[PDB]
Amino acid sequence: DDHYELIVDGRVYYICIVCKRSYVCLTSLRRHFNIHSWEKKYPCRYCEKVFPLAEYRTKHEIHHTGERRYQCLACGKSFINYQFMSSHIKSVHSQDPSGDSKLYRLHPCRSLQIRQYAYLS
DNA sequence: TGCTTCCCGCGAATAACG
DNA sequence: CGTTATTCGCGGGAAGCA
Ligand SMILES: [Cl-]
Ligand SMILES: [Zn+2]
Ligand SMILES: [Zn+2]
Ligand SMILES: [Zn+2]
Numbered sequence: 001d002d003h004y005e006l007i008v009d010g011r012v013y014y015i016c017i018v019c020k021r022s023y024v025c026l027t028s029l030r031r032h033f034n035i036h037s038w039e040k041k042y043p044c045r046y047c048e049k050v051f052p053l054a055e056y057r058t059k060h061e062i063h064h065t066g067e068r069r070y071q072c073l074a075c076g077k078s079f080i081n082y083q084f085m086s087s088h089i090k091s092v093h094s095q096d097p098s099g100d101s102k103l104y105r106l107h108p109c110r111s112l113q114i115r116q117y118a119y120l121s
Numbered sequence: 122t123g124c125t126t127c128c129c130g131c132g133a134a135t136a137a138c139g
Numbered sequence: 140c141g142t143t144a145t146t147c148g149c150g151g152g153a154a155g156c157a
């Protein structure tokens with residue numbers, strides 16, 4: 001089909017026929033396989049570009065709107081994405097958002113229409 | 122070398138099904 | 140509808156890049 005299976009120990013892995021990348025979940029391999037396949041297009045509704053993954057388009061479109069959903073809770077600065085936010089918190093506040101504390105807040109997306117997680121309210 | 126985008130397990134929201 | 144299958148948002152490390 002589009003993959004074969006591998007089994008080590010009990011573990012089942014799904015392997016991409018084309019690039020031989022390994023996946024624990026089949027939904028993952030299918031999501032990945034569109035990169036080879038290009039059977040689904042995710043075109044940017046603001047410009048030319050097309051993406052092989054829905055989430056790539058979504059990150060892209062937020063950069064069009066300028067919305068800043070990531071807010072540092074120590075000083076209030078807002079950021080476009082996780083990486084800027086984390087980078088800020090680590091350098092300025094000398095803390096890590098990975099472990100434990102709610103150091104930042106992610107606002108619901110309001111600059112465009114995407115699926116909304118009830119926990120962000 | 123520090124931004125920048127990619128990656129993929131995980132599971133919530135929604136769609137397709139019956 | 141209830142009940143499933145599907146989509147895709149998210150974290151945060153990795154990989155890419157100039
Ligand atoms: Cl904003
Ligand atoms: Zn592949
Ligand atoms: Zn665009
Ligand atoms: Zn701050």
